[PDB]
Amino acid sequence: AEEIEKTRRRVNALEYMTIPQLEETIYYIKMKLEENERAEVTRLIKVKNM
Amino acid sequence: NPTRMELTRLKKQLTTATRGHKLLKDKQDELMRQFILLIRKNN
Amino acid sequence: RRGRPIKQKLNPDVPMITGQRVIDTFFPVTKGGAAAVPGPFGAGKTVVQHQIAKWSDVDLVVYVGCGERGNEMTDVVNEFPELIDPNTGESLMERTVLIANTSNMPVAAREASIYTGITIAEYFRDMGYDVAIMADSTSRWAEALREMSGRLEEMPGDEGYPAYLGSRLAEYYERSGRVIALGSDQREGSITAISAVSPSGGDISEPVTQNTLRVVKVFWGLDSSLAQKRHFPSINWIQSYSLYSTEVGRYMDQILQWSDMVTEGMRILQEEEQLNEIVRLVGIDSLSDNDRLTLEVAKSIREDYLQQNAFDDVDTFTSREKQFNMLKVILTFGKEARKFNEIMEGRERISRSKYIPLAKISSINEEIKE
Amino acid sequence: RRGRPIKQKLNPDVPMITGQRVIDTFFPVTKGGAAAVPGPFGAGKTVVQHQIAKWSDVDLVVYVGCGERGNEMTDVVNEFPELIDPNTGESLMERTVLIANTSNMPVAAREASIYTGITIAEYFRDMGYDVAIMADSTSRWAEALREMSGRLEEMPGDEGYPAYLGSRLAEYYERSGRVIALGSDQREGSITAISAVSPS
Amino acid sequence: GMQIGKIIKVSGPLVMAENMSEASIQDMCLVGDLGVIGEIIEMRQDVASIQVYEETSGIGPGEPVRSTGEALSVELGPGIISQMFDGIQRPLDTFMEVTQSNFLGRGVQLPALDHEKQWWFEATIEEGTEVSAGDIIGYVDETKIIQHKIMVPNGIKGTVQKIESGSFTIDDPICVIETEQGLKELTMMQKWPVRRGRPIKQKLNPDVPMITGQRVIDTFFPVTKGGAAAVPGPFGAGKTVVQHQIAKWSDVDLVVYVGCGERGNEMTDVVNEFPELIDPNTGESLMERTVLIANTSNMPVAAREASIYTGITIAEYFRDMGYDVAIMADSTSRWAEALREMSGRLEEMPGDEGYPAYLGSRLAEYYERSGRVIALGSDQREGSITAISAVSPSGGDISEPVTQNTLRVVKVFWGLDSSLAQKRHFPSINWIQSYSLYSTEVGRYMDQILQQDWSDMVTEGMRILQEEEQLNEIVRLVGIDSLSDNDRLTLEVAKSIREDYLQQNAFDDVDTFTSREKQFNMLKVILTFGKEARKALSLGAYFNEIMEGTVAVRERISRSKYIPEEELAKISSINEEIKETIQLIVSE
Amino acid sequence: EYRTIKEVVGPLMAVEKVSGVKYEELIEVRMQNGEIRRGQVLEVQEDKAMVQIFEGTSGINLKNSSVRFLGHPLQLGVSEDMIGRVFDGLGRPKDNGPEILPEKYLDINGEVINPIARDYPDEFIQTGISAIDHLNTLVRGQKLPVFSGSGLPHKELAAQIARQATVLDSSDDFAVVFAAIGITFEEAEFFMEDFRQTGAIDRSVMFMNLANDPAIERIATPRMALTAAEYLAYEKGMHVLVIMTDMTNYAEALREISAARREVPGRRGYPGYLYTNLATLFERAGRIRGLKGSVTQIPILTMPEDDKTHPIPDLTGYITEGQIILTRELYKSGIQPPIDVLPSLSRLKDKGTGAGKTREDHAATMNQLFAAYAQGKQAKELAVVLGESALSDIDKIYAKFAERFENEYVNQGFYTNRTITETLDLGWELLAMLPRTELKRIKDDLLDKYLP
Amino acid sequence: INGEVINPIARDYPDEFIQTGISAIDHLNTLVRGQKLPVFSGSGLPHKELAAQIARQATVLDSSDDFAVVFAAIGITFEEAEFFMEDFRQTGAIDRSVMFMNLANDPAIERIATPRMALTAAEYLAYEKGMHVLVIMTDMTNYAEALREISAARREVPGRRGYPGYLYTNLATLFERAGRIRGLKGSVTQIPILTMPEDDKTHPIPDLTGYITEGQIILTRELYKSGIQPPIDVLPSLSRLKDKGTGAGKTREDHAATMNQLFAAYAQGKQAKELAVVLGESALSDIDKIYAKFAERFENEYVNQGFYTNRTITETLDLGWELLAMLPRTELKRIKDDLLDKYLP
């Protein structure tokens, strides 16, 4: 019973904390990268015209 | 912080963590079955 | 801006003795080699370079303070004359040249300090001397290129750096190296380049670090995580590399009568890393005795060998032989223990090997086995 | 566009009574203080702002509908007349000035509505009154500046907002505060700013 | 005839030329003395800005620019069948013969069709007949299989004045029409701009199911005549075998194959294997009714972008005759890469992942050109173009722009799966991930034409497959020995569907094609066994008893796929043996 | 008429030597081959005008082409004869019907309702869908969108509302304006077939824009529809229900046109002005003081990646008065329509419910059903995480409640129309499962009268 | 030096097996005569040693005709150029070779010209002189960086991730200068080598190259840090023409089957190693303990052959069978009992 509970806690830590934290961070990075690359090409086109 | 190296690494940790979750859940289930047999003998 | 001409470029195959364990053992540099040290701020950027400057077995050291803090230049001129080579009796300042263009000095002069330094080093190289040139930091040089590029309204490359950035760095590092100098004597000389890089936040994907690593051969990645827990020098042993490892290994095997032990040491470190990828996202719960032993050997490599205090009178430098004996002891314990709670409760002598002035280290092997 | 002159600003150290338990207890705003109310869509931003308009112990409310729903402006004009103080018999409409430039009205006018509001607030502050200014929503004001910055072909800053977004907003809020007003009287007056933000 | 331009600027791939004021936007031009392929992108006064699609090394100011007077077009007429072109309709066979080289030299320009070959034109309309676009004035027996119908071109309307049978080249006037603008002459060839869809009278719903003969497709994921399907093409999942089966077995008249911009060595495979495909009806080569576009990655960006457009314009041409055409593109990921390159070259504002902001629209423009139509002309004939398109994303992930914009406008998705190929399941189409939006309509058609509840059986077949997924996870965890008799049975029926139905050997003489009638009978017996055995379970019989008692009849089900088309009764009579065998089991 | 085209670059054209040209003025280009292409003035400066051609500029020869400036912006010729007729994105007849004679022509941008003249949305529209009529009530003058996703049955729900929607106790003065934006041929045919088969066509105006139509036409489409709606509502006194799908295709077209003018991209690549632009469509909904008639809007959109924070659903949500959410979970359970009432909301619902609008028991039961359902689903999720042995009975009762609620109440079928009376009665049947002691959101007088 | 594009119908299909002497290539990711098969490496990975080894050991079985090697060095350091030249001289391979050496400190326009010089030489030897030519080029990334430099000099606005939009055309024009030609005796086989920026395969350079070339050989840091030489990771590696150069006549009949089997057992063994770390050695079955040991030996003895070890196809296939011999008959499913009874020790 003790081993069951210790196994359960590790499962729930992964399920409700570790994995979602990784999911949310991946989403964030992915978005931020995307934004900066659009801003970068926008500026390049401006510098192009200069 | 939001670099492409972090992205690829975190994507790897997610795959690993997902597999570890499945493995530990199976272990818990296997322990549960064996417990069922013992706990009935205990009763 | 013109490289001083030579007769012939040669292969740099003699390893430099820096006396810093992690470097000389796992990520070595040769006389004529080029090494980059990219690190976040507060990684011990400075102390690492000072250590190399003071302990390397070169004839002359050209130190270039490029766009950095003035107080660090002041420290060098105060400390260097006080560092006496006992086999010689004269100070390290008597074999040093200093070039200083601080962070608040005119921008354009950062580029000049870099080229001024390398040319002076080539001059001494041409005499048949082994020279080490310290560029700290190359990033401030690159930002001077970027500011000027911006002012010329050139099309910038990544992060605003000019499209010719890769090429500039290449032109600098191609001036380093082992050569046969011009002259009837055909004297042999060399320039070893040690360059600090300062990627923002420690993101090594930035163009300065990345273009640098395509032309240098040694990568000493400083790590903020190591620095925060006071692991110094904070060199990331998984990220770092040396393209001279193979050749230096051959040389060391011959001199000492080692390659296998360095390979085995790195393999343990790599294994600990892969194990820790799991322990972080699962826990140390279900570890076998074998895996627990691996983690203990790796712990020993990290704490007893990699960690090294530049401010300790003894620990500040470790000779080739002392290095050999220390790695031997560490690996021996691992090998014998491999042959868990039982063994661990029955290693302090190993932890303090770094403070031994040689028979007191070698004798540990017999205490381990018994 | 120019803040009305005063003698000097004073520390806003008197908590305002909104009668909203969560606010007065844990997150109180002082008279002359400023509160941002940022939230996602449909989180009851209009109910909150109405409650503060309706219950705060101020002499006058300036309510600015900046780039928002037509119906919410209509709702204010319909409801405010009906909210009667039982003691004095005055309606909330009889102590309110509201300024309205809905989401589909001229874009530039969103900026205009902001400054029209705060200037009327300063006016009644000068008389020695406590005034509340509700701006709903300042996000639409910023969008209007971003649209104009584009037309002007400016270098854009963070997220396309002009580089001077910071300072324009800072100027706005620094016009709020508790003051000693001009006049030999040295009378005291305040502007309390409640601003909705609508972050994407 | 139109004014020749003079180059004023060469800068990388960009050329500017003055004296271009009589040329038009999107005109194709020959740039320099060399005369390399270019296109007019901009015009300021008389100065045209030109994108050059071939190496601009060696070109300079002074040199001439000649416009071709039209945007990128195709020649359409006798001599187009069995030819292999690049994206811009350069005749690859002719290039070898004429230039006597293995290479496509910059500056070499050759006509797409053969303007010298004699054809027998057979007149089928007599003089004095009122005609307009689409009306058939005659035919040429062009290949061993396909009859090429000579139609009145678009923009011609009037009375036939002179026409007769005879031998002509595609340049000879075979007809005289008295139009409103006066007497005009017709030849056997017409031109058409690839970017503009060939016009129709009415677009119709594609509600006729295609017979591919491939069981997983026709039954569970059907495409209709005029429909479209997207197919991801991971390596080693046997995409080409599936494509070849579809090309030779499907009941269309003509196949148009488009290689968009493929790896050099992969293109060569297709160029080799496709002519070696044999037409099941005639025993001739498939090329006898195929037009093939072959682009390698080093073809000009113009040809790689035009690839699918060139192909569908040709398909539309054959469609206008009243034919059913399949247009098969592989890979549209590589076509889109040409668009992404063009976006960058034009210094545009980029859309997602650097693709042009118009990517969605261009894909929609392509797929909406496929379909079932009533062609123009007083016949009111129906034609169709069915589109089968390969996608091959960087990461194999669907969510990327190319596959995503495609799936917004196509109604069928065949998810080829490399894991299924590694488990020796062929064709490798994932029955869970795949879908067809035509299933419900096809189902009504089938129930009517077969006079059976075919749709009820298809859904029941899928339901067992869906439930199998759930049961497999339990087997992996708990164990096969821990399942109920009902569940053990369901797994067997799902295994039978997978093995005896889904799995299909393209290289077996009988298994390579399954007729619509045969498919019914096969799925009927597989489901009948499930029905009868489950009825046996609820009567008190045991799972193991049913299995051990029905060894002979289950093997008959397994061999159903090899039953000849002439002996469909040998499948249908399995039904009686099922009922009889299980009856004895329930007894004994 | 000018033969002075000076530049063509892509879809853009610059015309010189002109006079009296205005911003947004509609233009007509006569090509050298007699082909006619229309456009819009994007920008006007001294003697130059920058214009964009709807169809694009391919094949246009500059020197031999000419430009007519029409003197007015994009217009819709309106008539009451539009009911029962089908038009394209630009208001051109698409049904080959008889010739259509405009009473007047209207700027498709409309004019803004004076906030002082605006009347708050009021009174009930019966959609026939229980999940909407009871819990997320549609009010006349409301803008109430449907958030779906690809693969979800929003096309069936849209067509269902279009034929089922009605006003009670008011005969022959309700109409539907249906705008299809950037949809494929086949999906367009679905709507066409459905309207004609059910007879919904006789009370509808339809504007059909296809995925392969010009992107400028795709963005003109909802403006054509709304101009027609305002005419029928405010000038003819009708209650008009405007349904538009798919708003996601609209926004994509907007990004396409934006990027073509090389405007600086905003959040997620969409124009900086996406909010403002959407508002100029959705704010046309409402009522006017002293006028009979109303415009009610139901924009339909697919959330990319089912991400509710994506610009399209997010800024829409900031503009509309609520949202109806379709879910993958409920759709895979066969619930038709798969409406999740937990994240769904109608903000104006109080103005269309209660005595004499629906029925006196409307508000109370709604609150009770919603609150019991939330608790029911919570107990179901508790059985998943901790087992069935974790639940008290009543927890078990609430769990069973949520099952019936989804299977019998929310699930009603795509061809099934429920009167508000049928909806409310059915609500009481579900509430009867619970102990009366648990119906704590409803006062005693209502419980005694209605509880079966 | 620009070349002319090969008529797509005039190219012939790759037929002949090329023995590189490297098990992880010849067996699992076979190089075929006329293929374009690149190596994806990284900064501080030993692609230098592997390039030298491939050039050194590459041969076609029988033929009499030997391999002429064209070696282009693009933007590399002197130290590396000297290594290559010294290895070619010290082994006598230079007598078979033509070398074009471009250095890091050479102009960007020289770096751009280098691959084109090399390939022009190769097509002359191959298609005009009838020779069989192996072309090896490192580092392609340096070529790409040179493009950006010239592109910026003409003030062109970049495409994806800072590279020219016409990068595709540019790289495709290079890599498709290869293969057999119908009617001609000679051939060009291409092995481009590139380092992946930040070890990212989605980067424009490796991403576009993959779209052009018939597969890729992947070197990894994890394998190198473990001392595996060459550090080839077979799981993400692929050769798309492999089924065309293998089997009876070409290599041996048991080529295909052993490859599939080794691949599957390797993946299975890696899973087993991970299982032991997650759940303990308790959770491993007796079969599982073997797979774990299989994957260990596979990396250490099969993949890890050393940069100066030249394995014949026979030796390689034999070693595969000795490792597959660890497994019971029951596990070797992808191998028919016919050939399992002929070769299994």
CSV table of C-alpha atoms in Angstrom, one decimal, chain F residues 165-306:
chain,number,residue,atom,x,y,z
F,165,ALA,CA,-35.3,31.0,-36.0
F,166,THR,CA,-38.6,32.8,-35.4
F,167,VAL,CA,-40.3,35.5,-33.4
F,168,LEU,CA,-43.4,34.7,-31.4
F,169,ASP,CA,-46.7,36.6,-31.6
F,170,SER,CA,-45.6,38.6,-34.6
F,171,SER,CA,-46.3,37.2,-38.1
F,172,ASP,CA,-44.5,37.6,-41.5
F,173,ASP,CA,-41.9,40.3,-40.5
F,174,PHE,CA,-38.8,38.1,-39.8
F,175,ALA,CA,-36.1,37.3,-42.3
F,176,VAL,CA,-32.6,35.7,-42.5
F,177,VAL,CA,-29.6,37.2,-44.2
F,178,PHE,CA,-27.0,34.5,-44.8
F,179,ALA,CA,-23.5,35.4,-45.7
F,180,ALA,CA,-21.0,32.7,-46.7
F,181,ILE,CA,-17.4,33.8,-46.6
F,182,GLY,CA,-14.6,32.0,-48.4
F,183,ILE,CA,-16.3,28.6,-48.4
F,184,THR,CA,-15.7,25.7,-50.9
F,185,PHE,CA,-18.1,25.0,-53.8
F,186,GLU,CA,-19.4,21.8,-52.0
F,187,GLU,CA,-20.1,23.6,-48.7
F,188,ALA,CA,-21.9,26.3,-50.6
F,189,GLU,CA,-24.0,23.7,-52.3
F,190,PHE,CA,-24.9,22.2,-48.9
F,191,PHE,CA,-26.3,25.5,-47.8
F,192,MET,CA,-28.0,26.1,-51.1
F,193,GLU,CA,-29.6,22.7,-51.2
F,194,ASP,CA,-30.7,23.0,-47.6
F,195,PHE,CA,-32.4,26.4,-47.9
F,196,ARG,CA,-34.3,25.3,-51.0
F,197,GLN,CA,-35.3,21.9,-49.6
F,198,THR,CA,-36.7,23.3,-46.3
F,199,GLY,CA,-38.1,26.4,-47.9
F,200,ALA,CA,-35.9,28.6,-45.8
F,201,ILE,CA,-35.0,30.3,-49.1
F,202,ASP,CA,-38.4,32.1,-49.2
F,203,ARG,CA,-37.6,34.1,-46.1
F,204,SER,CA,-33.9,34.6,-46.7
F,205,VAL,CA,-31.3,36.8,-48.6
F,206,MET,CA,-28.1,34.9,-49.4
F,207,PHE,CA,-24.7,36.1,-50.2
F,208,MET,CA,-22.3,33.4,-51.3
F,209,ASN,CA,-18.6,33.9,-51.5
F,210,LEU,CA,-16.3,31.1,-52.4
F,211,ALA,CA,-12.8,30.0,-51.4
F,212,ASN,CA,-11.5,30.7,-54.9
F,213,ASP,CA,-13.1,34.2,-55.2
F,214,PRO,CA,-10.9,37.3,-55.0
F,215,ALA,CA,-9.8,38.0,-51.4
F,216,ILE,CA,-11.2,41.6,-51.6
F,217,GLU,CA,-14.6,40.2,-52.5
F,218,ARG,CA,-14.3,37.9,-49.5
F,219,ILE,CA,-14.0,40.9,-47.2
F,220,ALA,CA,-16.7,42.8,-49.0
F,221,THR,CA,-19.1,40.0,-48.5
F,222,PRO,CA,-20.2,40.5,-44.9
F,223,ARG,CA,-20.6,44.3,-45.6
F,224,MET,CA,-22.9,43.6,-48.5
F,225,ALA,CA,-24.9,41.3,-46.2
F,226,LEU,CA,-25.1,43.8,-43.4
F,227,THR,CA,-26.1,46.7,-45.6
F,228,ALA,CA,-29.0,44.5,-46.9
F,229,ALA,CA,-29.9,43.6,-43.3
F,230,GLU,CA,-30.0,47.2,-42.2
F,231,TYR,CA,-32.2,48.1,-45.1
F,232,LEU,CA,-34.7,45.3,-44.4
F,233,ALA,CA,-34.6,46.0,-40.7
F,234,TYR,CA,-34.7,49.7,-40.4
F,235,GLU,CA,-36.4,50.7,-43.6
F,236,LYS,CA,-38.8,47.9,-44.0
F,237,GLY,CA,-39.3,47.3,-40.3
F,238,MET,CA,-38.2,43.7,-40.2
F,239,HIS,CA,-36.5,41.6,-37.6
F,240,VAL,CA,-33.4,40.3,-39.5
F,241,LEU,CA,-31.1,37.6,-38.3
F,242,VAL,CA,-27.7,37.8,-39.9
F,243,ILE,CA,-25.6,34.6,-39.8
F,244,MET,CA,-22.1,34.7,-41.2
F,245,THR,CA,-19.6,31.8,-41.6
F,246,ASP,CA,-16.8,31.3,-41.6
F,247,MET,CA,-15.3,34.4,-39.9
F,248,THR,CA,-11.9,32.7,-39.8
F,249,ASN,CA,-11.8,32.6,-43.6
F,250,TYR,CA,-12.7,36.4,-43.5
F,251,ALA,CA,-9.8,37.1,-41.3
F,252,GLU,CA,-7.4,35.1,-43.4
F,253,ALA,CA,-8.5,37.1,-46.4
F,254,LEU,CA,-7.9,40.3,-44.4
F,255,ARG,CA,-4.3,39.2,-43.6
F,256,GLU,CA,-3.8,38.3,-47.3
F,257,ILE,CA,-4.9,41.8,-48.4
F,258,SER,CA,-3.0,43.5,-45.6
F,259,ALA,CA,0.2,41.8,-46.5
F,260,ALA,CA,-0.3,42.6,-50.2
F,261,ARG,CA,-0.2,46.3,-49.2
F,262,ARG,CA,2.8,45.3,-47.1
F,263,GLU,CA,1.3,46.7,-44.0
F,264,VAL,CA,3.1,45.9,-40.7
F,265,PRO,CA,1.8,42.7,-39.2
F,266,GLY,CA,0.3,42.6,-35.7
F,267,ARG,CA,-0.2,39.8,-33.2
F,268,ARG,CA,0.1,36.4,-34.9
F,269,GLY,CA,0.5,38.0,-38.2
F,270,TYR,CA,-3.0,39.5,-38.4
F,271,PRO,CA,-3.4,43.2,-39.1
F,272,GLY,CA,-2.9,45.6,-36.2
F,273,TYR,CA,-6.4,46.7,-36.8
F,274,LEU,CA,-8.1,43.3,-36.7
F,275,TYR,CA,-10.2,44.3,-33.7
F,276,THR,CA,-11.3,47.6,-35.2
F,277,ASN,CA,-12.1,45.9,-38.5
F,278,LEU,CA,-14.2,43.2,-36.8
F,279,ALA,CA,-16.0,45.7,-34.7
F,280,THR,CA,-17.1,47.6,-37.8
F,281,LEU,CA,-19.0,44.4,-38.8
F,282,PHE,CA,-20.4,43.2,-35.4
F,283,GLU,CA,-21.4,46.6,-34.0
F,284,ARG,CA,-23.9,47.0,-36.9
F,285,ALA,CA,-26.1,44.7,-34.8
F,286,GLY,CA,-28.6,46.3,-32.4
F,287,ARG,CA,-31.9,48.2,-32.2
F,288,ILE,CA,-32.8,51.8,-32.7
F,289,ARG,CA,-35.1,53.9,-30.5
F,290,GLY,CA,-38.4,54.6,-32.2
F,291,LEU,CA,-37.9,52.2,-35.1
F,292,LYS,CA,-39.6,48.8,-35.4
F,293,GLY,CA,-37.0,46.3,-36.6
F,294,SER,CA,-33.6,45.0,-35.6
F,295,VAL,CA,-30.4,43.5,-36.7
F,296,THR,CA,-29.2,40.4,-34.8
F,297,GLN,CA,-25.9,38.8,-35.7
F,298,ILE,CA,-24.5,35.3,-35.3
F,299,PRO,CA,-20.9,35.2,-36.6
F,300,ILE,CA,-19.6,31.7,-36.9
F,301,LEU,CA,-16.0,30.9,-36.7
F,302,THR,CA,-13.5,28.1,-36.3
F,303,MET,CA,-10.9,28.5,-33.6
F,304,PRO,CA,-7.5,27.6,-35.0
F,305,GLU,CA,-5.9,24.7,-33.0
F,306,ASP,CA,-9.1,25.0,-30.8
